[PDB]
């Protein structure tokens, strides 16, 4: 029943501001501390901000000290994170996480009800925050012709924005041996991935192979047949 829900994520140009909101429910919001943890594109976890049960103690991450601001509303079950002057390096999934419902002072005594942001026992689904100056674009689909056991063919989806893109082969029929690689951000601020599939050596001449690229954020749908 206990759940945390993030909101406020989305595309933001460099230098812009944004405000994240977290709705706590199913627990006594008053006793717990809270904190924000972000996770970049396929990387580890980084501590961003945190606040205690009453909000009297608020620490921030080293990278974001001064730019970010955390606040809470105990009378409405909300945790906020004001983010100012966003750089491309702040692109990540931001998790709203619940702290403790207690604390322990210097003398080693336990204080019930005075929660803090030591560790986090409850995490939300997180909200995605993309910081880029580039504009929305549909992908260009180039073929990867098999030339000289077996043979590999594929589709190079290049220069699109933003994520995601879905690649399927022969609609829903072809699945076995298909490898869709994670997208890679280029120097131009545009994404680009590859999707390959291995087929029998003599299977080329008989049956055709199409990759169904589907980029919803640009209303783009592309069918690409691949041949030597």
């Amino acid at each position: 029943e206990v759940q945390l829900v993030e909101s406020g994520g989305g595309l933001i140009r460099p230098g812009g501001s944004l405000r994240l909101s977290c709705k706590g429910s199913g627990f006594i919001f008053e006793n717990f501390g809270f904190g924000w943890v972000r996770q970049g594109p396929g990387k580890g976890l980084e501590w961003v901000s945190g606040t205690n049960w009453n909000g009297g103690d608020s620490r921030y991450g080293d990278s974001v000290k001064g730019r970010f601001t955390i606040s809470r509303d105990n009378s409405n079950n909300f945790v906020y994170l004001q983010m100012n002057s966003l750089r491309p390096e702040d692109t990540a999934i931001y998790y709203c996480a619940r702290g403790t419902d207690y604390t322990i002072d210097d003398q080693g005594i336990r204080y019930q009800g005075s929660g803090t942001f030591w560790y986090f026992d409850v995490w939300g689904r997180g909200t995605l925050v993309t910081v880029s100056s580039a504009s929305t674009k549909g992908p260009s689909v180039f073929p990867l012709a098999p030339s000289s056991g077996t043979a590999a063919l594929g589709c190079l989806v290049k220069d699109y924005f933003p994520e995601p893109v879905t690649v399927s082969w022969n609609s829903g029929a072809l699945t076995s041996g298909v490898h869709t690689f994670p997208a890679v951000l280029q120097s131009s601020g545009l994404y680009s991935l590859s999707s390959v599939v291995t087929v029998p050596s003599s299977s080329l001449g008989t049956q055709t192979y199409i990759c169904n690229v589907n980029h919803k954020p640009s209303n783009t749908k592309v069918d690409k047949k691949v041949e030597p």
Binding site: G44, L45, D62, F117, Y119, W123, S140, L144, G154, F181
Partner: protein, 214 residues
Amino acid sequence: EIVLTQSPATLSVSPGERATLSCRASQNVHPRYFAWYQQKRGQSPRLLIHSGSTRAAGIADRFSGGGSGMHFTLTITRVEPEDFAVYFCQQYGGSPYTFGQGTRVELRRTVAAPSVFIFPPSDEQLKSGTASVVCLLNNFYPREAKVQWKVDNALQSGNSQESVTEQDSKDSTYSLSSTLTLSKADYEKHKVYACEVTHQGLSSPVTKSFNRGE
């Protein structure tokens, strides 16, 4: 500031074996001020151990933490297939609170050599001013593999990007793609395009290549 260093980077284990993850703190940390998190693919992280060696809510019996000073460990008695994920260690004895870079727990299988393919820049792309040469490594274990590009016996650097799949669900292998991007101008200036792959399953570095327009 306390820097946490997890080792090993990748922990290759088999279902049933015992797993011991390590975290090397730069400064001394009180044993009661440490935590461990688990994160399966595509999901939010989850607390396993808090207060040094206390199992979180609904955490299985096999998980256990401990340690003091600069060395902390998380131990799984026998690992289940549900335990294959990324594990982060966290300290909170010193401000600011920091995480480890993470330890990937993978399913260990037998060594498999990569099937190396190579793709020339499509004519559709060359007609648009760019050129992308793709080098593919198929179904290879372990994850460690070095790929170096050679254009007319000249080593490349910085102009190539790599991407690798998650561990396959069927055969527990990996697949890697290395994309070398060049302008159409510099692409026409050359003839031989090679891709030298170095792997454990190979007795010696395999080199797949093609000649432009042949």
